[PDB]
Amino acid sequence: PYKGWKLYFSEVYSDSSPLIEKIQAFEKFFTRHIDLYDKDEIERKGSILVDFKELTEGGEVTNLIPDIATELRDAPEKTLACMGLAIHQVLTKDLERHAAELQAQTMVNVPHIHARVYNYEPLTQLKNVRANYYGKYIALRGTVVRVSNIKPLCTKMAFLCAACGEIQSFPLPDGKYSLPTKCPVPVCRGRSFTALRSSPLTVTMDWQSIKIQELMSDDQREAGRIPRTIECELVHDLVDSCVPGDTVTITGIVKVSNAEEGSRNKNDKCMFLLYIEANSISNSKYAIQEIQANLFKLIVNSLCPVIFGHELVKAGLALALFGGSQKYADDKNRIPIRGDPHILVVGDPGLGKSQMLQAACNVAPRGVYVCGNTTTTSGLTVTLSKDFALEAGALVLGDQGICGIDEFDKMGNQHQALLEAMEQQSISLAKAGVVCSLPARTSIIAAANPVGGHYNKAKTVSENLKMGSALLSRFDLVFILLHQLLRKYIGYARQYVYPRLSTEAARVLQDFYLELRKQSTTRQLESLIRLTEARARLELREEATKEDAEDIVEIMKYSMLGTYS
Amino acid sequence: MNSDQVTLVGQVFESYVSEYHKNDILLILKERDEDAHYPVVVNAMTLFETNMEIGEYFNMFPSEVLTIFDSALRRSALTILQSLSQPEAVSMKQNLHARISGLPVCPELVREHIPKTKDVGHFLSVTGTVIRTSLVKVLEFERDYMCNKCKHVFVIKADFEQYYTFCRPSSCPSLESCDSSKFTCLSGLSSSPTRCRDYQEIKIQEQVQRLSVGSIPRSMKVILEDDLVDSCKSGDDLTIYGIVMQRWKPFQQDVRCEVEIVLKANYIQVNVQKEFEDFWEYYKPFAGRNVILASLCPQVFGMYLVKLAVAMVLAGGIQRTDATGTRVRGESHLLLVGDPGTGKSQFLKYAAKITPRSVLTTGIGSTSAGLTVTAVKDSGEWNLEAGALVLADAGLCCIDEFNSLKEHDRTSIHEAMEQQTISVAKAGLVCKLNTRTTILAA
Amino acid sequence: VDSCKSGDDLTIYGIVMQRWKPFQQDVRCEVEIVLKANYIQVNVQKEFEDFWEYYKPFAGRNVILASLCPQVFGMYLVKLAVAMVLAGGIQRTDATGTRVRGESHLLLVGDPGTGKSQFLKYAAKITPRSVLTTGIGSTSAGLTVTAVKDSGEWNLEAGALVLADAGLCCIDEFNSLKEHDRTSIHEAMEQQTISVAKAGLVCKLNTRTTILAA
Ligand SMILES: [Zn+2]
Ligand SMILES: [Zn+2]
After folding, report:
1. Count of other CB atoms within 10 angstroms of residue A467
2. Chain-chain contact of B138 with A128 (C-beta, under 8 angstroms)
3. CB under 8 Å to B37, separation ≥6 — which residues?
4. Which of A335, A433, A521 sits opposite C113 (nearest CB)?
5. Does the beta-carbon distance from A263 to B201 stay under 8 Å?
6. What are phi and psi of A64, to 5 degrees?
7. What does the entry list as the binding residues for ATP (chain C)?
8. What is the distance in A from the centroid of ligand 2 to the CA of B68?
């Protein structure tokens, strides 16, 4: 009466077992809510997404499941199996009725349906995950760092008993081919089984291993605490649902990892080891109003409270933190060019250029700080690791954020891919026959030292700075030198306000550009717009006026004043 | 311990926790997570002052005494829970660990060196610096088995001395004497219990800055379990209490043996007099300055100001905190722009050898890799190495040939002289490191 | 066996099977999906017809040129020349059996920041089977061939001038290359081929491509 019983439970079917009660409970729940889901998509993908708020709705549809929360948290592998068998029974009953109606005017083979529950609460942070969570169902939310490749994984294996002819679906622990020790029927214990690898009970699915790092407060919770990470295993439809850098919410069971990695030294090898079996994954991709109502100078001076002077440098840093408009026409595939401006700090030692890059990475919600001596090509570009996987580098880790590069005059070919990232918002990969293009929508702020030390002489910027024109033409702002509340304000502005350029702001830029032409790169004008739009996002305004443009022009005037000397 | 010893220990501890140590257990019961390991820190000196035999039995059998302490902690937690008007407002906690702290100050229990084979099996404290930390981990520690004749479910423990490996027994520990030797394992068949204890291996080293530690410090492995994990990081000054044990692996067909003395931790703590009083009375000041300055460096002619300035360098300083919460330094900085061979180098070297917790270098002989930070790597693993400006934290850093350095070695020194900190960003190691030090340059 | 080499375009018919090795005492398992081969083979429409009827020609050139790169002011000849670059070409064969190329070559000697780089990059993203680089950022190791080695084993790695076979290769900062990167480009522009002779890898590789430089 239960077709597919062996697809979820390895036990022998018995109407006296306590499984029937929960199975019929979830079957009632699914029959009452059969119109809420797409049966075709459930059959094709082999899974079903159920809202946890629907199970805890309370009433009549959930009458036979009053303790769904406790049973799911403490016994997930049993509750999910019962739920999957119930939805499979509902689908096969509906399809058998349809097939009978078709025959009147009956072998329906419904495959395995993964019962996936999303939007689970309470949310459990990774730092509070200990060993006692083993066998429990919890939900986490974090940023993806590593995404491995898709690989086949044999979950179950079919075994035919030579005594009674019964075929069982024995699950494998970590994929280890083990032989059953007794026949599942309580009659004969033949203890001799033949493997049936072509049988439908032998379950083989796609498998992926992702790594999740906790959402760490870059200043509050950074008082000696390291960001904790954990491994998650996606299977079947959950495979290829997130890329490195996305913030995803993953609900699943906590299970023991047994490989074991390493080694060595000295020493990150751990025999003792944890991981998460992912059941569902969701990928997204007042004090503020007092601040909006001298806002520019207040945020500017509050970026680095330990750096004296550099008022224009802090002014460009705030503009880069908010950023312009990522004007990507998704309906026209019109590239957004770039809305993230770049900053160059040309200064002598002892000015605090490194401290400005630190504050750039600290106040930003996604900051990556890099020194310019211990440099590797894989430290900034994507890293290829084959047995292949692509590991995000500093130019990829800084996506939707700011990356700071100190002493880049000391970097060699490990730095030239940053030029391709500042312009294409992407990283080029070509190694070991693997060719790809990875995202890198980041804002690059950098600082360097002059050629002959103190350069208050008759030379200009392109001559005194240890840098060629291939990178000088890529910066929106060049400055020549010789916390949590503003963090929330910047994060809210990057998510809420999308700026535009008005006509009054353009007329000011037209007059300055025409007067600059009469004195006789194009990216200079692109900087005027990208910083003006950044000023509109700073003021939480959807449209930048002439006042914002004049301020951006004066900032660019200071950049062009230190230059062209 | 016989029955009398266990009885007296239990009674003394039960009376002590029924009289005091109530708010700690109340706060433990008030927590939400019921499956969590909760520690109960107890001063060992005040506890051993209440009864004479408890200290003897603790120093004689530490593990069983700690087990009895945990049992009595559970009993006292239940008693305090039953004494509340609304017992349902809190929840009982079964994973209670008695963590010993504040041992009687003596050289036999408070150690500054790595314990030897003589101290195996004794409970003591070791003070050192953390040089290495491992990740936080999860895996099994007990395994359930069942008998084929009486269906009695018993449990076997993992041998800590054999790196938590299980050995199959051959006797039924049921209440009725079963002659059955056939047992079945139930560890991997199901997941009915969540019996798994936390585990972390840290590495501590003797502090060469101490007077008792010689030239070459020794290292030691410390095993933290349950709530003791995630309690320290690389570079911390720890005072670890615990039991010195031996973990070993024997010879095999192609494998060699390996024995190791480790420290199973129980609690973690993050860190002539009459003559001096008479010298201070005579100083209370110009004649005292002449004595200190002459005694600081007697191998030099004149240079009264340099001897005085060095005195202030070794003297200062004390940190402060302003209205913005910014740390305001204390440590001094003296520059000696002297002609070569005038003896300025003779100052700094003798001053670095005369002072405990002191470092030195000779400029270009140690670049920024030897002054600040270095990301020591090996496979996909790395740690933080300390330089001259870091090892001198709460100490002195001397740098001869100070202008012979590169502009990037000076930039690193610029940060250490301006923030008490050094920014780390090498390879995959990004952090903010405290370098509260004074710098005596020439 | 012996029916294909490294770099061929194959259409393999066969059965998808699984080869596995189980766990042992000290050995881990490994499962792999392989293809047991059975045969080897070496390798809106109405709108386009209506657009072709209107083109059949000067008004059509203005539409293609404006639609090729609308992000640029003027430069009618550059938009037209790029159109011929993406257009050409077709190989021929003379009386001596020599292969006569088809693919075009356009050089853009423009002042920096005039937008010539905006052309080539959008043109490389708009075109299927297309490659690009920025001169000195990719030397001859990334333009032609590289003998990837490991123990006494090696293979052939394709560069910018090779991956663009039957496609387009764009090179900004074209004069920023070394005289040996240009020599490798000289051969690809003059023979449709690139000579291989690195380590123990000696061969003649076909690089039938067009090169759009700036
Ligand atoms: Zn059977
Ligand atoms: Zn028995």
Report:
1. 20
2. no
3. A130, B95, B96, B97, B198, B226, B227
4. A521
5. no
6. -90, 10
7. 110-117
8. 28
